[PDB]
Amino acid sequence: HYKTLRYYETVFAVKPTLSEEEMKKKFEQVKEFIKQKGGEILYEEDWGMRQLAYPIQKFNNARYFLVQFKTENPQLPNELDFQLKIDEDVIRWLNIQIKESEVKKN
Ligand code: NA
């Protein structure tokens, strides 16, 4: 059915020189940014430190977070992408539109 409420998944990688406390704060900041722009946070995963397939700004590891959200704001994925792009601490960002049935929980 045609519907303007859409579901999205965002995955981003934080540079490994931030402290555990800074990484978790970054995640909360991304969530609050999404919440600002008319998005409801449905789900979230912390994937911890992961080896990168190939280096990024001379880094071989990074901190991965994942968040799913829903919104009627069609520009939120554009917005989030720009925000994660310009954030110097976020060295990788990926935005995926997902189905409603792909929303997870716990
Ligand atoms: Na960035």
| Domains parsed from the chain with CATH numbers | 1-106 (3.30.70.60)
Q: Resolution of this PDB entry, in A?
A: 2.3
Instruction: Tell me the sheet residues that pair with 93.
Output: 12
61-to-22, 91, 95, 100 alpha-carbon distances in Å: 16, 10, 20, 32
Instruction: Please tell me the distance from the alpha carbon of residue 46 to that of residue 105, in angstroms, as a whole number.
Output: 13
How was this model experimentally determined?
X-ray
Distance from the alpha carbon of residue 54 to the mean position of ligand 1, in angstroms: 16
Do residues 12 and 90 lie in contact, with contact meaning Cβ atoms separated by under 8 Å? Answer: yes
For residues 59-82, one letter each, b for 16 or more C-beta atoms within 10 angstroms of the residue's C-beta and e for the rest, the string is: eeebbbbbbbbbbeeeebbeebee
| Alpha-carbon span 53 to 10, nearest angstrom | 19
Rounded Cα gap, residues 27 and 37, in angstroms: 16
3-state DSSP assignment of residue 86: helix
Distance in angstroms (rounded) separating the CA atoms of residues 29 and 17: 18
What number of other Cβ atoms are within 10 A of residue 87's Cβ? 17
DSSP state of 60: S
Ligand 1 geometric centre to CA of 48 (Å):
18
Question: What's the CA dihedral at 59, 63, 69, 71 to 10 degrees?
Answer: -40
Cα 100 to averaged position of ligand 1 atoms, centre (Å): 28
Q: 3 CA distance to ligand 1 centroid (A)?
A: 31
d(CA 14, CA 22): 10
84 CA distance to ligand 1 middle (Å): 5
**What's the rounded Cα separation, in Å, for the pair 105 and 83?**
26
What separation in Å is there between the alpha carbon of 55 and the centre of ligand 1?
A: 14
Element (H, E) at 77: helix 76-86
